[PDB]
């Protein structure tokens, strides 16, 4: 159910500004954890967390041309499966 | 006066526990903040109302109207000895209230 | 043991309330920090027993003993104020509590 | 037999002061000390900021050099003791 609609608004060779639909007031979670790592897997992934009222987040420090996989987890799996997508800088 | 804040702390705790049953594991941000605000207020209310009235009385009174009001608004929209027993403690408050 | 890990939760709250009179409106450090800690302990143990103990049983047990426990701690830690006549009101408040949970 | 005690200026700086105070005994420790600073001449209001009661030190910034100021460390209420106030010229 939440989060819903994970897409990339702006894109730099080294950065990605992502956004999602945080739900709607009474379905606002307290936080979303965002996981971004290389689409391959030669190294582990990176991960941070964003407050639940926020629907957007920035991802800095990426390598140009490399494809990445971004996942936005809810606080728990009860709010639905985590939405994940793919993008190339 | 002192039994106004005690009952105000009763309403606060009741609203907190109900906003807790609405929210999940403190994840639903809006009612999660409600529970924190309701609690932080109610604890600051009990801290101030315990200096006035005897504490074992503010204790007893709270456990009374607590389940009394929690089951009062239970039949409100959500989910016999409970109606008369309500008036029983309610009269018990009437012989420890001003 | 569920009923005994409840007893830790009820006594932690019983201890914490008498410290809240020392908290001085949450303006005195050590009693102010003391009552939030004692209540955190009560939280930890009640939820530990709610997976085994039914609701109103644990609550009315808390009620009667809690009215009893701190009122004797108040008759010793501090003393007595009393602004009305009947002590038995709290026992029949507890009784009114006992007959809307158990009954 | 009051708190806080011994309000002193540890370090100084044209635009910042570092102060401390004797918090007293453990039963004399409070939850939040509020601290007020302003000009000695008194042609302005009084800036105010709080600090948790488990810290006996506080740092102030944004001062104008050369001016004489008056610092006063308060308490949550007026029951713990009279507030200690001192002076210092940056
Ligand atoms: C953490 N905490 C919650 C509620 C109370 C409380 C005390 C006495 N009564 C009767 C009800 C609620 C005390 C502490």
Numbering used by the authors:
A (entry chain D): 4 to 92
B (entry chain B): 2 to 80, 85 to 103
C (entry chain A): 2 to 104
D (entry chain C): 3 to 92
From the paper:
Proteins from the bacterial small multidrug resistance (SMR) family are proton-coupled exporters of diverse antiseptics and antimicrobials, including polyaromatic cations and quaternary ammonium compounds. Representatives of the ‘Gdx’ (guanidinium export) subtype export a bacterial metabolite, guanidinium ion (Gdm+), in exchange for two protons. Representatives of the ‘Qac’ (quaternary ammonium compound) subtype are proton-coupled exchangers of quaternary ammoniums and other hydrophobic, cationic compounds. The overall fold and many of the binding site sidechains are shared between EmrE and Gdx-Clo, yet the two proteins have markedly different substrate selectivity profiles.
We were able to obtain diffracting crystals in the presence of five structurally diverse compounds transported by EmrE: monovalent planar aromatic harmane (3.8 Å), divalent planar aromatic methyl viologen (3.1 Å), quaternary phosphoniums tetraphenylphosphonium (TPP+; 3.4 Å) and methyltriphenylphosphonium (MeTPP+; 3.2 Å), and quaternary ammonium benzyltrimethylammonium (3.9 Å). The methyl viologen-bound protein crystallized in P1 with two pseudosymmetric copies of the EmrE3/L10 complex in the asymmetric unit, organized in the same relative orientation as individual complexes in the C121 crystal form. For all substrate-bound structures, the maps show positive densities between the substrate-binding E14 residues, including a four-lobed density for TPP+, a three-lobed density for MeTPP+, and oblong densities for the harmane and the methyl viologen structures. In the two copies of the methyl viologen-bound transporter, the drug is bound in different (but overlapping) positions. In the present structural experiments, we observe this explicitly for methyl viologen, which we identified in different but overlapping positions in the two transporters in the asymmetric unit. For the other substrates (methyl viologen, TPP+, and MeTPP+), this comparison showed that binding site sidechains, especially E14 and W63, adopt different rotamers, thus accommodating the differently sized substrates. For example, the carboxylate of E14B is displaced by 2.5 Å when the bulky quaternary phosphonium TPP+ is bound, compared to its position when the planar methyl viologen occupies the binding site. Although all the substrates in the present EmrE3 structures were contained within the aqueous pocket, we similarly observe rotameric rearrangements of the TM2 sidechains in different structures, including Y40EmrE and F44EmrE (equivalent to Gdx-Clo’s M39Clo and F43Clo) in the harmane and methyl viologen structures.
